[PDB]
Design an enzyme around this catalytic site. Structure first.
Site, PDB file in Angstrom:
ATOM      1  N   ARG A  49       0.864  -1.164   0.000  1.00  0.00           N
ATOM      2  CA  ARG A  49       0.000   0.000   0.000  1.00  0.00           C
ATOM      3  C   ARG A  49       0.909   1.224   0.000  1.00  0.00           C
ATOM      4  NH1 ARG A  49      -2.863   0.844   5.465  1.00  0.00           N
ATOM      5  NH2 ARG A  49      -0.953   2.025   5.872  1.00  0.00           N
ATOM      6  N   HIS A 530     -11.604  10.577  16.468  1.00  0.00           N
ATOM      7  CA  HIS A 530     -11.646   9.158  16.132  1.00  0.00           C
ATOM      8  C   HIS A 530     -11.295   8.280  17.331  1.00  0.00           C
ATOM      9  CE1 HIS A 530     -10.832   5.573  13.463  1.00  0.00           C
ATOM     10  NE2 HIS A 530     -10.017   5.298  14.469  1.00  0.00           N
ATOM     11  N   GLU A 531     -10.190   8.602  18.005  1.00  0.00           N
ATOM     12  CA  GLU A 531      -9.769   7.849  19.182  1.00  0.00           C
ATOM     13  C   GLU A 531     -10.778   7.946  20.328  1.00  0.00           C
ATOM     14  OE1 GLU A 531      -7.606   6.009  18.243  1.00  0.00           O
ATOM     15  OE2 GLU A 531      -6.934   7.260  16.543  1.00  0.00           O
ATOM     16  N   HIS A 534     -13.838   5.848  19.728  1.00  0.00           N
ATOM     17  CA  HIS A 534     -13.614   4.421  19.984  1.00  0.00           C
ATOM     18  C   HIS A 534     -14.074   4.021  21.379  1.00  0.00           C
ATOM     19  CE1 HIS A 534     -12.040   2.602  16.513  1.00  0.00           C
ATOM     20  NE2 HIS A 534     -10.799   3.053  16.568  1.00  0.00           N
ATOM     21  N   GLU A 593     -14.528   1.176  13.308  1.00  0.00           N
ATOM     22  CA  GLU A 593     -13.660   2.167  12.670  1.00  0.00           C
ATOM     23  C   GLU A 593     -14.464   3.219  11.916  1.00  0.00           C
ATOM     24  OE1 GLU A 593     -10.640   2.538  13.315  1.00  0.00           O
ATOM     25  OE2 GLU A 593     -10.424   0.664  14.429  1.00  0.00           O
ATOM     26  N   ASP A 597     -14.725   7.230  12.611  1.00  0.00           N
ATOM     27  CA  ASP A 597     -14.400   8.189  11.557  1.00  0.00           C
ATOM     28  C   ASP A 597     -15.489   9.256  11.476  1.00  0.00           C
ATOM     29  OD1 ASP A 597     -12.739   6.116   8.990  1.00  0.00           O
ATOM     30  OD2 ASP A 597     -11.923   7.038  10.750  1.00  0.00           O
ATOM     31  N   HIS A 658     -10.247  -1.327   9.487  1.00  0.00           N
ATOM     32  CA  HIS A 658     -10.467  -0.027   8.852  1.00  0.00           C
ATOM     33  C   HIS A 658     -10.976  -0.228   7.436  1.00  0.00           C
ATOM     34  CE1 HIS A 658      -7.050   0.370  11.711  1.00  0.00           C
ATOM     35  NE2 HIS A 658      -7.700   1.453  12.101  1.00  0.00           N
ATOM     36  N   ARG A 664     -13.165   5.497   3.441  1.00  0.00           N
ATOM     37  CA  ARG A 664     -13.228   6.311   4.655  1.00  0.00           C
ATOM     38  C   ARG A 664     -13.660   7.736   4.346  1.00  0.00           C
ATOM     39  NH1 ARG A 664      -8.365   4.562   8.771  1.00  0.00           N
ATOM     40  NH2 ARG A 664      -9.690   5.718  10.263  1.00  0.00           N
TER      41      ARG A 664
HETATM   42  C1  LIG Z   1      -3.824   4.184  10.063  1.00  0.00           C
HETATM   43  C2  LIG Z   1      -4.849   3.347  10.822  1.00  0.00           C
HETATM   44  N1  LIG Z   1      -5.154   3.962  12.110  1.00  0.00           N
HETATM   45  C3  LIG Z   1      -6.288   4.639  12.276  1.00  0.00           C
HETATM   46  O1  LIG Z   1      -7.186   4.670  11.448  1.00  0.00           O
HETATM   47  C4  LIG Z   1      -6.423   5.395  13.564  1.00  0.00           C
HETATM   48  C5  LIG Z   1      -5.657   6.713  13.455  1.00  0.00           C
HETATM   49  C6  LIG Z   1      -6.158   7.568  12.303  1.00  0.00           C
HETATM   50  C7  LIG Z   1      -7.375   8.228  12.386  1.00  0.00           C
HETATM   51  C8  LIG Z   1      -7.835   9.017  11.333  1.00  0.00           C
HETATM   52  C9  LIG Z   1      -7.071   9.165  10.183  1.00  0.00           C
HETATM   53  C10 LIG Z   1      -5.849   8.511  10.098  1.00  0.00           C
HETATM   54  C11 LIG Z   1      -5.394   7.714  11.149  1.00  0.00           C
HETATM   55  C12 LIG Z   1      -5.918   4.539  14.709  1.00  0.00           C
HETATM   56  P1  LIG Z   1      -6.927   3.464  15.434  1.00  0.00           P
HETATM   57  O2  LIG Z   1      -7.678   4.247  16.480  1.00  0.00           O
HETATM   58  O3  LIG Z   1      -7.700   2.762  14.346  1.00  0.00           O
HETATM   59  C13 LIG Z   1      -5.959   2.301  16.260  1.00  0.00           C
HETATM   60  C14 LIG Z   1      -4.956   1.645  15.313  1.00  0.00           C
HETATM   61  N2  LIG Z   1      -6.824   1.285  16.842  1.00  0.00           N
HETATM   62  C15 LIG Z   1      -6.949   1.214  18.165  1.00  0.00           C
HETATM   63  O4  LIG Z   1      -6.373   1.982  18.919  1.00  0.00           O
HETATM   64  C16 LIG Z   1      -7.848   0.132  18.717  1.00  0.00           C
HETATM   65  C17 LIG Z   1      -9.260   0.674  18.909  1.00  0.00           C
HETATM   66  C18 LIG Z   1      -9.870   0.171  20.214  1.00  0.00           C
HETATM   67  N3  LIG Z   1      -9.012   0.664  21.280  1.00  0.00           N
HETATM   68  C19 LIG Z   1      -9.887  -1.322  20.256  1.00  0.00           C
HETATM   69  O5  LIG Z   1     -10.161  -1.980  19.267  1.00  0.00           O
HETATM   70  N4  LIG Z   1      -9.544  -1.943  21.483  1.00  0.00           N
HETATM   71  C20 LIG Z   1      -9.091  -1.181  22.658  1.00  0.00           C
HETATM   72  C21 LIG Z   1      -8.848  -2.280  23.813  1.00  0.00           C
HETATM   73  C22 LIG Z   1      -8.921  -3.729  23.006  1.00  0.00           C
HETATM   74  C23 LIG Z   1      -9.525  -3.422  21.700  1.00  0.00           C
HETATM   75  C24 LIG Z   1      -9.983  -4.379  20.881  1.00  0.00           C
HETATM   76  N5  LIG Z   1     -10.360  -5.235  20.172  1.00  0.00           N
HETATM   77  C25 LIG Z   1      -4.322   1.962  11.035  1.00  0.00           C
HETATM   78  O6  LIG Z   1      -3.849   1.656  12.125  1.00  0.00           O
HETATM   79  O7  LIG Z   1      -4.375   1.142  10.127  1.00  0.00           O
HETATM   80 ZN   LIG Z   2      -9.595   3.448  14.839  1.00  0.00          ZN
END
Ligand SMILES: C[C@H](NC(=O)[C@H](Cc1ccccc1)CP(=O)(O)[C@H](C)NC(=O)CC[C@H](N)C(=O)N1CCCC1C#N)C(=O)O
Ligand SMILES: [Zn+2]
Ligand SMILES: *[C@@H]1O[C@H](CO)[C@@H](O)[C@H](O)[C@H]1NC(C)=O
Ligand SMILES: *[C@@H]1O[C@H](CO)[C@@H](O)[C@H](O)[C@H]1NC(C)=O
Ligand SMILES: *[C@@H]1O[C@H](CO)[C@@H](O)[C@H](O)[C@H]1NC(C)=O
Length: 696
Positions: A49, A530-531, A534, A593, A597, A658, A664
């Site tokens: 990618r 976004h965070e 979540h 995700e 977003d 994602h 997105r």
């Molecule tokens: C670039 C892309 N990142 C992403 O979109 C975002 C950043 C972003 C946002 C917008 C534009 C570009 C980048 C990161 P993100 O929140 O998606 C992360 C990888 N994901 C997490 O932090 C996990 C989520 C949540 N905590 C979760 O699922 N949990 C928490 C405890 C256990 C568990 C489970 N199952 C990528 O990583 O591919």
């Molecule tokens: Zn995320």
């Protein structure tokens, strides 16, 4: 009234160069935002990618190279150790001269690879059991095969650790691959050929006789095993509900509800759990609590495992480890991987050694490397501005609760409570710069030799697993960072109720103190949202302010959430992706995700409005016939300028939670009334559907 500054020029030029203004924003905003990038760039041979996001990661690797490649005299031991590890890894000559010998000498210690041995049954007749063989791979080498036992955080008591049992990962990227037809045929062919190639090389190096028929027969049997295991695993769509996943029983309840018989046994869960834990001199009762994530998988395992020989099981089990090791051996072994990774990733060449090595050291010493990275690369007063943005967007989320008509008042106030409790983590832990002792001590028991890359990486697996296991009776460290700083990404932890923005992501196009705020909010602003969101998606909504798995929803709101979000399941589920051969997205697996977003960009937009309100319109960017509302969306979209290899699109559509970057942008902006305002979009404009999804 145009901004004329150094920093404005750079910003504008990046925006102009990426975009294609001959495209109507309201027909395809991705093409509008990114069409210029798409014309000028091809995906590198080493990339699956490529795009603005992956370029930031390449550029971060250059920084890591600079800070790792020269010994300095002031370097504390922790840094000496990262540098020596880097050096061992980049020395191909040393590695090539070792052939596969480092593997060969390892193999005995995992109960062999029978296809690559003589008389395997008699060698290990005295010693082998499934309990012991699974446990050695798990506990010394961190390879989880057949049954994944792991110490982690207790979902229902976030301050403690429990033993987990779960289904294992597979050799192929997802369970779908094991259909082995059509878009999956080459991968399956390459996979099994890969097994064969490596079994052959080991035999040749041991100077054993090669029977191509026997090789094929034993590795095809391996595939049939794994096919069955793959089919037994629970779908991701069935693993999205953390309340359903959490089944806490004792090892006794498990012994008696989830029996296995292997090689005529049967299987002792007590014994298994203790062969692992004893690695670290801990002793476990039949009465130990265990969180079993994959009940039905264990049940379905029973009739599969009985059917196969010890020889079959260990052929799969050792293969799954050897897989991961071949690229750390000599060229000939590295080469054997080629068709497999092309099939999975599309790439026709290995990523440069120094990049792979920099990434590997960062992965294993993320605090040491993080320290070096921020010293080189990261301001200072970034931390504080971001701190401000996070205040702002947390407040916007709270505020938005009152406009939100699909929740009742107790649930809204519970959501507020969770919002206020979210603990933010920005840039890097001061610890890693200002406390040398603590950083040296983290890696105290590590000792690398520069001529012994393979021993170095084995040491790391053992040390990693030992640390994790000994956490069983320890309390969870509140203060501990869940990411290194040298990371282009951001994170939410439901277990810590924590948002995390590593230094690596705090740069253009996401953030600079010197770029327009329209860009900052559309960039990092939207990432913060976004965070946070979540914390309130189909996973996180299930965890409370302390990170505990506990229902704080009324039946009505819980049901309404599901109903509101089902709209996005249908929406994104309906996107078809050419690169993946017209396949539809999994609207269920991407939901969380997608929710993050849509919530995130809304929240960031409203925070920027609250900012323009208080502070005033900002100066326009030169060369661009857009106002700042428009630039806000322009920048949000350009985060995701890029594209995919078809082989990786087929992979990602199944394995990435994602949505692909283009969807997105389209997905979220289809749901944005504010976007349609800004670019004056007709009702039923492709970008302005009359019907829109909303959760947060
Ligand atoms: C670039 C892309 N990142 C992403 O979109 C975002 C950043 C972003 C946002 C917008 C534009 C570009 C980048 C990161 P993100 O929140 O998606 C992360 C990888 N994901 C997490 O932090 C996990 C989520 C949540 N905590 C979760 O699922 N949990 C928490 C405890 C256990 C568990 C489970 N199952 C990528 O990583 O591919
Ligand atoms: Zn995320
Ligand atoms: C690579 O390792 C070998 C060990 O045989 C050593 O002789 C050589 O100096 C190393 N090269 C570098 C650049 O460290
Ligand atoms: C587990 O069972 C095996 C079966 O032979 C036994 O030899 C071993 O000592 C047991 N290990 C533990 C940790 O009890
Ligand atoms: C596409 O949307 C329609 C209408 O909501 C829905 O019935 C259909 O299942 C969707 N497709 C997918 C695979 O989500």
């Amino acid at each position: 009234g145009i901004c004329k500054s150094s920093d404005c020029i750079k910003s504008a030029a990046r925006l102009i160069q990426n975009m294609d203004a001959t495209t109507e924003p309201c027909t395809d905003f991705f093409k509008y935002a990114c069409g210029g990038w798409l014309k000028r760039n091809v995906i590198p041979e080493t990339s699956s990618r490529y795009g603005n996001f992956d370029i930031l990661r390449d550029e971060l690797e250059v920084v890591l190279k600079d800070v790792l490649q020269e010994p300095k005299t002031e370097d504390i031991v922790a840094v000496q150790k990262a540098k020596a590890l880097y050096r061992s890894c980049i020395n191909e000559s040393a590695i090539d001269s070792r052939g596969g010998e480092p593997l060969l000498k390892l193999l005995p210690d995992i109960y062999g690879w029978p296809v690559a041995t003589e008389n395997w049954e008699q060698k290990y007749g005295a010693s082998w059991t499934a309990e012991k063989a699974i446990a050695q791979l798990n506990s010394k080498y961190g390879k989880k095969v057949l049954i994944n036992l792991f110490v982690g955080t207790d979902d229902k008591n976030s301050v403690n650790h429990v033993i987990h049992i779960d289904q294992p990962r597979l050799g192929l990227p997802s369970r779908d691959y094991y259909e082995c037809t059509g878009i999956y045929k080459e991968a399956c062919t390459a996979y099994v050929d890969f097994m064969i190639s490596v079994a052959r090389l080991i035999r040749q190096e041991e100077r054993l006789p090669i029977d191509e028929n026997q090789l094929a027969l034993e590795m095809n049997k391996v595939m049939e095993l794994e096919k069955e295991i793959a089919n037994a695993t629970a779908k991701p769509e069935d693993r999205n509900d953390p309340m359903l996943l959490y089944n806490k029983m004792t090892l006794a309840q498990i012994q008696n509800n989830f029996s296995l018989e292997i090689n005529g046994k049967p299987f002792s869960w007590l014994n298994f759990t203790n062969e692992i834990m004893s690695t670290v001199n801990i002793s476990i009762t039949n009465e130990e609590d265990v969180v079993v994530y994959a009940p039905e998988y264990l049940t379905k395992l029973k009739p599969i495992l009985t059917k196969y020989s010890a020889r079959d099981l260990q052929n799969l089990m050792s293969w799954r480890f050897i897989m991961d090791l071949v690229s750390s051996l000599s060229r000939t072994y590295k080469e054997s991987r080629n068709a497999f990774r092309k099939a999975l990733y599309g790439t026709t060449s290995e990523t440069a050694t120094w990049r792979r090595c920099a990434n590997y050291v960062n992965g294993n010493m993320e605090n040491a490397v993080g320290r070096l990275y921020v010293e080189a690369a990261f301001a200072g007063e970034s931390k504080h501005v971001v701190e401000d943005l996070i205040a702002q967007i947390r407040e916007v989320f709270i505020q938005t609760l009152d406009d939100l008509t699909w929740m009742d008042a107790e649930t809204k106030k519970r959501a507020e409570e969770k919002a206020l409790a979210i603990k933010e983590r920005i840039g890097y832990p001061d610890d890693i710069v200002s406390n040398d002792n603590k950083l040296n001590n983290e890696y105290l028991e590590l000792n690398y030799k520069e001529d012994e890359y393979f021993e170095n990486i084995i040491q790391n697996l053992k040390f990693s697993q030992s640390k994790q296991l000994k956490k069983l009776r320890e309390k969870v460290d509140k203060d501990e960072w869940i990411s290194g700083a040298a990371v282009v990404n951001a994170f939410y932890s439901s277990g810590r109720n924590q948002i995390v923005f590593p230094a690596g992501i705090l740069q253009p196009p996401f953030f600079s103190a010197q770029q327009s705020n329209s860009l900052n909010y559309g960039g990092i602003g939207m990432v913060i949202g976004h965070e946070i969101t979540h914390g309130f998606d189909d996973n996180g909504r299930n965890f409370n302010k302390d990170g505990d798995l506990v229902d704080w929803w009324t039946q009505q709101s819980a049901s309404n959430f599901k109903e509101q979000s089902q709209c996005m399941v249908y929406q994104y589920g309906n996107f078809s992706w050419d690169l993946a051969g017209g396949q539809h997205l999994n609207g269920i697996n991407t939901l969380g995700e997608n929710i993050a977003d849509n919530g995130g960009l809304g929240q960031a937009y409203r925070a920027y409005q609250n900012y323009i309100k208080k502070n005033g319109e900002e100066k326009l960017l030169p060369g661009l016939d857009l106002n700042h509302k428009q630039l806000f969306f322009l920048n949000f979209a350009q985060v995701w300028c890029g594209t995919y290899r078809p082989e990786y699109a087929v992979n990602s559509i199944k394995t990435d939670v994602h949505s692909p970057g283009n969807f997105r942008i389209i997905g979220t902006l289809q749901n944005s009334a504010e976007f349609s305002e800004a670019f004056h979009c007709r009702k039923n404009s492709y970008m302005n559907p009359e019907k829109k999804c909303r959760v947060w």
